[PDB]
Amino acid sequence: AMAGVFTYESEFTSVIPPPKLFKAFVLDADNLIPKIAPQAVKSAEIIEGDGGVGTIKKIHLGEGSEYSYVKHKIDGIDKDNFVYSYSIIEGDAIGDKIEKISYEIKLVASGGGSIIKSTSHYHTKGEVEIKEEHVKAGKERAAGLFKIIENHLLAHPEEYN
Ligand SMILES: Oc1cc(O)c2c(c1)O[C@H](c1ccc(O)c(O)c1)[C@@H](O)C2
């Protein structure tokens, strides 16, 4: 029956500045990734909402994740300060051990690069197993994807200006 929340903090740098990165990784992620990283993600669609806060999206994952869905709940967007927060509410790692996973992502200017500050909140249930390796994975995973994006924009500077 026991509820809890485990909360983890992570950072990535990028040479791409916030406002470009933001448009690519947040605002256009849904079409972009599927185009440049099919193994990551096949497609993404709005199930519910108006696209703003409170929208839910079914995201169709790629082979990397045995073609499994997740549903994302948009918790907030601030297009000015480059903040985005969304919770995974169904899908891959959302079992019994763990019931929602929530992210706040904050892009910070840093020398015409960015630092991507990421807070994740694993909403637990029952006993709490959290392995230094389960965290390293999920972290590598996210960074793998920012790297795909960063390198994509470096090779396509015509995009997201
Ligand atoms: O290989 C994977 C496995 C996953 O569970 C996920 C992956 C990639 O990336 C998905 C992802 C992450 C950020 C996104 O904007 C996105 O559209 C899709 C993430 O929610 C879940």
Numbering used by the authors: -1 to 159
Authors' own words:
Fra a proteins are members of the pathogenesis-related 10 family and are required for the normal accumulation of flavonoids and the development of color in strawberry fruits. PR-10 proteins belong to the START superfamily. These proteins adopt a helix-grip fold with an internal cavity capable of binding hydrophobic ligands. The data presented here demonstrates that Fra a proteins bind natural flavonoids, providing for the first time mechanistic insight on the function of these proteins in the control of flavonoid biosynthesis.
